[PDB]
Amino acid sequence: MGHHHHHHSHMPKATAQMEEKLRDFTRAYEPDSVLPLADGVLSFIHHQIIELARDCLTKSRDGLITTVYFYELQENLEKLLQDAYERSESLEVAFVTQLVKKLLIIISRPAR
């Protein structure tokens, strides 16, 4: 992220790279806004995009992320992926899918 005198972490660390990708990703928007998509169900799933993003971000910085954390988080994103694919009216779903997918790519092991 730099600052004035940047020459600090001269170790290519996945902490720096990923946490920056993740924070800049999540920073741009709100849980309740940039479409509630479908009011109720996909409003919940939009909350899930932004709140799993913010929580996993702060838990990465905290170091709380275990190996278990990732398995639960991935299968929860893919749960909500199929919940968004169960959302019969798909226009809003392009955002949802590309967001949880891009997030899954940011935290390594890129999706499809």
Swiss-Prot record:
Tissues/organs with expression: Expressed in fetal brain.
Family the UniProt entry places it in: Belongs to the protein kinase superfamily. AGC Ser/Thr protein kinase family.
Assembly: Interacts with the microtubules. Part of a low affinity complex that associates with, but is distinct from, the postsynaptic density. Interacts with SNTB2.
Residues shown, of full length: 187 to 287 of 1570
Implicated disorder: Mega-corpus-callosum syndrome with cerebellar hypoplasia and cortical malformations: An autosomal dominant neurodevelopmental disorder with onset in infancy. MCCCHCM is characterized by global developmental delay, impaired intellectual development, poor or absent speech, unsteady gait, ataxia, inability to walk, and variable brain abnormalities. Seizures and autistic features are observed in some patients. Brain imaging findings include an enlarged corpus callosum in the absence of megalencephaly, cerebellar hypoplasia, ventricular dilation, gyral abnormalities, and cortical malformations.
Physiological role: Microtubule-associated protein essential for correct brain development. Appears to link the dystrophin/utrophin network with microtubule filaments via the syntrophins. Phosphorylation of DMD or UTRN may modulate their affinities for associated proteins.
Signal peptide region: none
Superkingdom of the organism of origin: Eukaryota
Protein name according to UniProt: Microtubule-associated serine/threonine-protein kinase 1
Transmembrane segments: none
Protein localization: Cell membrane; Cytoplasm, Cytoskeleton; Cell projection, Axon; Cell projection, Dendrite
